């Protein structure tokens, strides 16, 4: 993207302010700063000596050039076999973001096809006409007999008294059938929208109308690497590798994608902020985010009981 | 007492079972890592509405 | 609005929803949790004990079925007759005829281990192979087509909310006829 | 030829792969036992008066004819209610904008009230059974029989269907076992194989198709649309299983039985059947009622007519 | 979930209640500890948990 | 002579199909817009 423009900006937010509290707590000094690439980080193989090594957070933290990585740490097995880590501050799960956001004239004579009031109308013109001969053939006439047949008709004859009654009892269980299934359709209107979880069959062998896409270089891909049967997921996948996951927001904003794979509390932040985004339900993977931390360090324990003293007071709801 | 009557002093050596945490028992052992988001709730009647 | 209120609320009550009013759960733990009110159970000494006795996690079930247990399915068509049973494992195909036979047996959805019913045997015998073999010929034709069509296959609204409004709307009719006679007599 | 030609002939020891089993197949070797329910089925394309108000029915014409007796009482003991009351009165079930006379008599307005009241409660219980009416899911369905009069010839309905198999299998073997005359049917709307008539059945290229139950299922259950519909549960059909055929004589069989019987009895096999399968396929006017109506309109002309030549 | 009468539904799911987590307290100096981590994150990570 | 500022009234009280039935010319105007009221009514 850019070949070098790396300036000094401001920085907020929550775990900006998390900083400001824990530097409110222990007597220390610390410098801002952003990692350069915008990946997560896998230890993928380097393309020398057949090693596997990391990148991105823990290629800079690895190799001296970070002290301490202020992240949402994805806390999972294979890091935490390389350096310590502390107490998981968010508890978060995954969820699937999706589209069901589309817009709405309610089929009233336009998208509603046109049987009924075409029908309705040579109808009432063949009673009016009808009418108009038992009128003649009596055992502004003309215009009597039609808004006679209308004002049956308009809800609000010693021998045509039957044709009327007929007529009437017809035009109103027509109606009454018309409201009856126009309200029964519009309460009912919640068609199979979703994934329900990962358990989703459609998923394992996805199509044109299935795209799902994920960050490119996460802990999701490592966690789904782990399973056996989420690989074929990632010939999907592996094709979609998006940098930034606001460039999966952009996508599936504009309809490129279907599915997103994302931690439930953010999207549920951009749900609040964005109105066209509604996530699915099952909630699975509850997870915890915590600090990424060094090794052996007489900065672990002090810092850990700081974390613990924002967890037991109303320290957490006040960052809520 | 109890768990921590057996643990700290060493009668025991650890408390599979579960157990709350909070400030002066995160001072006198080392919890493990969290395995399950247990929160706390009031519980009332609720009646129909 | 107080007629469309009303309306929507007939509408309303008659809203059929999935059954949650009963238990149908299999994995539920009010299974594995039972009450005063949750009486299931099964044949005495049947192959569902012993399918569960294969597994671990159902000492509970066999020691609230142990003051449970029937000696024939016919104790349990009784017992369900008379609402003294709430749940009971068993064939579908029965249940089926017993669901023609009364409308108020009702099965559930979740139909689980879809198993294999043949016929109990000896050991190696020149009357096993070409008994199997006759088994086959027999399925492999409609042989047990009429045999469904004779009792598993053939099974042997306004209505509800009329009888109690007809009764209250001739009684209203009934005092207001007096009355017109009050009115009438009383000019 | 195939597995039975590796087989039968010495050059395979036994075919893990699935197959469906029959009578020669099951004389050539030996099976294992059924460790799933997979029959054969047929894959396809794919009033309000008298079910609804029959005892009603009668209950309320008698209300009519009392509250119509009544007011005729009333009007000949205190300006039309000699002899028509039923047209004023069945005008008052629905109120439709009909201006029929001012009625002086107290009796007669208690009566206007009391009904328009019950009007208003069995309307609204109407539409009540209107919408339970729509509760339950309801398609259209032929006729699900195997000996159907259409399948002795498609002239007997003006759409003449078609069906073809996959050449030379098992299910061809079912038929000519059955009915030599389906074969003679099929010979001439046959077909290539499982995706072209997929494809058939898509673009709307074939009518029926013969094939196993389960596989038709799964592939319903992940339809565009959920449109290819099977004809019911396996009924009218063969409704078999699927074994592991082992030689004549293997030592295996009953140890591998026996390891079948362990993976269906701990929820094992439930558990790749839950990996393996699909359930979300679960189980607009209306078009014939108005015609029914429709047809109790030409009835209700012809007593008009009635009435009006005499 | 286990309730008879299923109609006691608490306030939200832990928004504006402590919402912490459960561990297993090992005395302070057990070199067994970080073994038990790494079988927790074991247990946790493959949907075992 | 006597709906000239009641018409508002007879566009207004059909609205709940109990109101008292105004005599309408038959100058080809009253009936066709109170059928279209009446439809939209029944629409809404
Ligand atoms: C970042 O890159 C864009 C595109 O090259 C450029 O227009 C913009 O000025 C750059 N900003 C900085 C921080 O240099
Ligand atoms: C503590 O904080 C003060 C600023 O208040 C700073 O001058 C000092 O260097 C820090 N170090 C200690 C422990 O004195
Ligand atoms: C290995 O080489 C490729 C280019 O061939 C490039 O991505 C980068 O320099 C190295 N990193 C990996 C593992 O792709
Ligand atoms: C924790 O508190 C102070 C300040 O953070 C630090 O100097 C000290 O070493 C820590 N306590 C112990 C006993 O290590
Ligand atoms: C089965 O039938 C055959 C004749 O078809 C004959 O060998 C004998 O009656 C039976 N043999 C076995 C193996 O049971
Ligand atoms: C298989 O069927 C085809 C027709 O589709 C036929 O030509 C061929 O001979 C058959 N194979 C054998 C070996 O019978």
Same mark, same amino acid.
């Given at each position: 993207?850019?070949?070098?423009?790396?300036?000094?900006?401001?920085?907020?937010?929550?775990?900006?302010?998390?900083?400001?509290?824990?530097?409110?707590?222990?007597?220390?000094?610390? #410098?801002?700063?952003?990692?350069?690439?915008?990946?997560?980080?896998?230890? #993928?193989?380097?393309? $020398?000596?057949?090693?596997?090594?990391?990148?991105?957070?823990?290629?800079?933290?690895?190799?001296?050039?970070?002290?301490?990585?202020?992240?949402?740490?994805?806390?999972? $097995?294979?890091?935490?076999?390389?350096?310590?880590?502390?107490?998981?501050?968010?508890?978060?799960?995954?969820?699937?973001?999706?589209?069901?956001?589309?817009?709405?004239?309610?089929?009233?004579?336009?998208?509603?096809?046109?049987?009924?009031?075409?029908?309705?109308?040579?109808?009432?013109?063949?009673?009016?006409?009808?009418?108009?001969?038992?009128?003649?053939?009596?055992?502004?006439?003309?215009?009597?007999?039609?808004?006679?047949?209308?004002?049956?008709?308009?809800?609000?004859?010693?021998?045509?008294?039957?044709?009327?009654?007929?007529?009437?009892?017809?035009?109103?269980?027509?109606?009454?059938?018309?409201?009856?299934?126009?309200?029964?359709?519009?309460?009912?209107?919640?068609?199979?929208?979703?994934?329900?979880?990962?358990?989703?069959?459609?998923?394992?062998?996805?199509?044109?109308?299935?795209?799902?896409?994920?960050?490119?270089?996460?802990?999701?891909?490592?966690?789904?690497?782990?399973?056996?049967?989420?690989?074929?997921?990632?010939?999907?996948?592996?094709?979609?590798?998006? #940098?930034?996951?606001?460039?999966?927001?952009?996508?599936?904003?504009? $309809?490129?994608?279907?599915?997103?794979?994302?931690?439930?509390?953010?999207?549920?932040? #951009?749900?609040?902020?964005?109105?066209?985004?509604?996530?699915?339900?099952?909630?699975?993977?509850?997870?915890?985010?915590?600090?990424?931390?060094?090794?052996?360090?007489?900065?672990?324990?002090?810092?850990?009981?700081?974390?613990?003293?924002?967890?037991?007071?109303?320290?957490?709801?006040?960052?809520? | 007492?109890?768990?921590?009557?057996?643990?700290?002093?060493?009668?025991?050596?650890?408390?599979?079972?579960?157990?709350?945490?909070?400030?002066?028992?995160?001072?006198?052992?080392?919890?493990?890592?969290?395995?399950?988001?247990?929160?706390?709730?009031?519980?009332?009647?609720?009646?129909?509405? | 609005?107080?007629?469309?209120?009303?309306?929507?609320?007939?509408?309303?009550?008659?809203?059929?929803?999935?059954?949650?009013?009963?238990?149908?759960?299999?994995?539920?733990?009010?299974?594995?949790?039972?009450?005063?009110?949750?009486?299931?159970?099964?044949?005495?000494?049947?192959?569902?004990?012993?399918?569960?006795?294969?597994?671990?996690?159902?000492?509970?079930?066999?020691?609230?079925?142990?003051?449970?247990?029937?000696?024939?399915?016919?104790?349990?068509?009784?017992?369900?007759?008379?609402?003294?049973?709430?749940?009971?494992?068993?064939?579908?195909?029965?249940?089926?005829?017993?669901?023609?036979?009364?409308?108020?047996?009702?099965?559930?959805?979740?139909?689980?281990?879809?198993?294999?019913?043949?016929?109990?045997?000896?050991?190696?015998?020149?009357?096993?192979?070409?008994?199997?073999?006759?088994?086959?010929?027999?399925?492999?034709?409609?042989?047990?087509?009429?045999?469904?069509?004779?009792?598993?296959?053939?099974?042997?609204?306004?209505?509800?909310?009329?009888?109690?409004?007809?009764?209250?709307?001739?009684?209203?009719?009934?005092?207001?006829?007096?009355?017109?006679?009050?009115?009438?007599?009383?000019? | 030829?195939?597995?039975?030609?590796?087989?039968?002939?010495?050059?395979?020891?036994?075919?893990?792969?699935?197959?469906?089993?029959?009578?020669?197949?099951?004389?050539?070797?030996?099976?294992?036992?059924?460790?799933?329910?997979?029959?054969?089925?047929?894959?396809?394309? @794919?009033?309000?008066?008298?079910?609804?108000?029959?005892?009603?029915?009668?209950?309320? &014409?008698?209300?009519?004819?009392?509250?119509?007796?009544?007011?005729?009482?009333?009007?000949?003991?205190?300006?039309?209610?000699?002899?028509?009351?039923?047209?004023?009165?069945?005008?008052?079930?629905?109120?439709?904008?009909?201006?029929?006379?001012?009625?002086?008599?107290?009796?007669?307005?208690?009566?206007?009230?009391?009904?328009?009241?019950?009007?208003?409660?069995?309307?609204?219980?109407?539409?009540?059974?209107?919408?339970? &009416?729509?509760?339950?899911?309801?398609?259209?369905?032929?006729?699900?029989?195997?000996?159907?009069?259409?399948?002795?010839?498609?002239?007997?309905?003006?759409?003449?269907?078609?069906?073809?198999?996959?050449?030379?299998?098992?299910?061809?073997?079912?038929? @000519?076992?059955?009915?030599?005359?389906?074969?003679?049917?099929?010979?001439?709307?046959?077909?290539?194989?499982?995706?072209?008539?997929?494809?058939?059945?898509?673009?709307?290229?074939?009518?029926?198709?013969?094939?196993?139950?389960?596989?038709?299922?799964?592939?319903?259950?992940?339809?565009?649309?959920?449109?290819?519909?099977?004809?019911?549960?396996?009924?009218?059909?063969?409704?078999?299983?699927?074994?592991?055929?082992?030689?004549?004589?293997?030592?295996?069989?009953?140890?591998?039985?026996?390891?079948?019987?362990?993976?269906?009895?701990?929820?094992?096999?439930?558990?790749?059947?839950?990996?393996?399968?699909?359930?979300?396929?679960?189980?607009?006017?209306?078009?014939?009622?108005?015609?029914?109506?429709?047809?109790?309109?030409?009835?209700?002309?012809?007593?008009?007519?009635?009435?009006?030549?005499?």
């Amino acid at each position: 993207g850019s070949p070098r423009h790396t300036v000094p900006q401001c920085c907020y937010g929550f775990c900006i302010d998390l900083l400001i509290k824990l530097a409110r707590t222990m007597n220390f000094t610390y #410098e801002v700063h952003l990692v350069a690439d915008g990946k997560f980080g896998t230890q #993928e193989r380097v393309n $020398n000596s057949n090693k596997k090594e990391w990148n991105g957070m823990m290629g800079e933290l690895l190799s001296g050039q970070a002290d301490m990585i202020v992240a949402p740490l994805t806390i999972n $097995n294979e890091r935490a076999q390389y350096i310590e880590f502390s107490k998981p501050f968010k508890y978060q799960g995954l969820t699937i973001l999706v589209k069901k956001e589309i817009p709405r004239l309610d089929s009233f004579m336009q998208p509603f096809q046109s049987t009924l009031w075409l029908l309705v109308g040579l109808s009432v013109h063949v009673v009016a006409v009808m009418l108009y001969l038992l009128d003649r053939f009596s055992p502004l006439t003309l215009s009597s007999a039609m808004w006679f047949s209308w004002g049956v008709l308009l809800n609000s004859s010693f021998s045509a008294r039957i044709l009327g009654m007929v007529w009437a009892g017809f035009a109103m269980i027509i109606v009454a059938s018309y409201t009856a299934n126009l309200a029964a359709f519009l309460v009912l209107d919640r068609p199979e929208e979703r994934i329900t979880g990962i358990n989703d069959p459609r998923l394992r062998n996805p199509s044109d109308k299935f795209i799902y896409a994920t960050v490119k270089q996460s802990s999701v891909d490592i966690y789904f690497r782990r399973q056996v049967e989420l690989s074929t997921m990632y010939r999907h996948m592996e094709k979609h590798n998006y #940098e930034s996951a606001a460039e999966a927001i952009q996508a599936v904003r504009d $309809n490129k994608l279907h599915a997103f794979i994302w931690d439930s509390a953010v999207l549920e932040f #951009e749900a609040s902020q964005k109105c066209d985004l509604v996530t699915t339900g099952e909630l699975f993977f509850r997870s915890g985010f915590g600090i990424g931390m060094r090794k052996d360090s007489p900065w672990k324990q002090n810092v850990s009981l700081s974390i613990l003293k924002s967890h037991e007071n109303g320290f957490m709801e006040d960052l809520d | 007492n109890g768990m921590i009557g057996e643990v700290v002093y060493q009668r025991a050596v650890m408390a599979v079972g579960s157990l709350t945490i909070n400030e002066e028992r995160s001072e006198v052992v080392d919890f493990s890592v969290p395995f399950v988001e247990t929160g706390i709730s009031v519980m009332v009647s609720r009646s129909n509405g | 609005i107080i007629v469309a209120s009303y309306t929507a609320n007939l509408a309303a009550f008659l809203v059929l929803d999935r059954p949650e009013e009963r238990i149908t759960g299999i994995n539920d733990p009010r299974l594995r949790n039972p009450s005063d009110k949750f009486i299931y159970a099964t044949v005495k000494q049947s192959s569902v004990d012993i399918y569960f006795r294969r597994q671990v996690e159902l000492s509970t079930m066999y020691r609230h079925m142990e003051k449970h247990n029937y000696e024939s399915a016919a104790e349990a068509i009784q017992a369900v007759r008379d609402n003294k049973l709430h749940a009971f494992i068993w064939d579908s195909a029965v249940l089926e005829f017993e669901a023609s036979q009364k409308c108020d047996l009702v099965t559930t959805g979740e139909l689980f281990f879809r198993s294999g019913f043949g016929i109990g045997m000896r050991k190696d015998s020149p009357w096993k192979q070409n008994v199997s073999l006759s088994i086959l010929k027999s399925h492999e034709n409609g042989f047990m087509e009429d045999l469904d069509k004779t009792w598993v296959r053939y099974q042997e609204l306004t209505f509800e909310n009329m009888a109690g409004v007809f009764m209250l709307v001739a009684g209203g009719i009934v005092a207001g006829i007096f009355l017109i006679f009050i009115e009438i007599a009383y000019k | 030829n195939g597995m039975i030609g590796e087989v039968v002939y010495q050059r395979a020891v036994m075919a893990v792969g699935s197959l469906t089993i029959n009578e020669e197949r099951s004389e050539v070797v030996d099976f294992s036992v059924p460790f799933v329910e997979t029959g054969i089925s047929v894959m396809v394309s @794919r009033a309000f008066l008298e079910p609804f108000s029959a005892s009603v029915w009668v209950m309320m &014409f008698v209300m009519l004819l009392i509250v119509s007796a009544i007011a005729v009482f009333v009007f000949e003991y205190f300006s039309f209610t000699i002899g028509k009351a039923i047209w004023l009165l069945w005008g008052l079930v629905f109120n439709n904008s009909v201006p029929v006379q001012n009625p002086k008599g107290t009796t007669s307005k208690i009566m206007v009230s009391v009904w328009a009241f019950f009007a208003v409660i069995f309307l609204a219980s109407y539409t009540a059974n209107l919408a339970a &009416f729509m509760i339950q899911e309801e398609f259209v369905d032929q006729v699900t029989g195997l000996s159907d009069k259409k399948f002795q010839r498609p002239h007997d309905y003006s759409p003449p269907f078609r069906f073809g198999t996959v050449p030379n299998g098992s299910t061809e073997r079912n038929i @000519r076992n059955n009915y030599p005359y389906m074969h003679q049917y099929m010979t001439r709307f046959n077909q290539r194989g499982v995706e072209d008539a997929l494809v058939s059945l898509k673009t709307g290229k074939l009518d029926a198709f013969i094939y196993d139950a389960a596989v038709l299922n799964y592939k319903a259950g992940r339809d565009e649309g959920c449109k290819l519909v099977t004809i019911g549960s396996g009924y009218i059909f063969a409704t078999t299983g699927y074994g592991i055929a082992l030689q004549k004589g293997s030592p295996w069989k009953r140890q591998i039985d026996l390891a079948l019987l362990q993976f269906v009895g701990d929820g094992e096999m439930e558990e790749l059947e839950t990996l393996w399968l699909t359930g979300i396929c679960h189980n607009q006017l209306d078009i014939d009622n108005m015609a029914g109506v429709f047809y109790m309109l030409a009835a209700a002309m012809a007593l008009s007519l009635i009435t009006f030549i005499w």
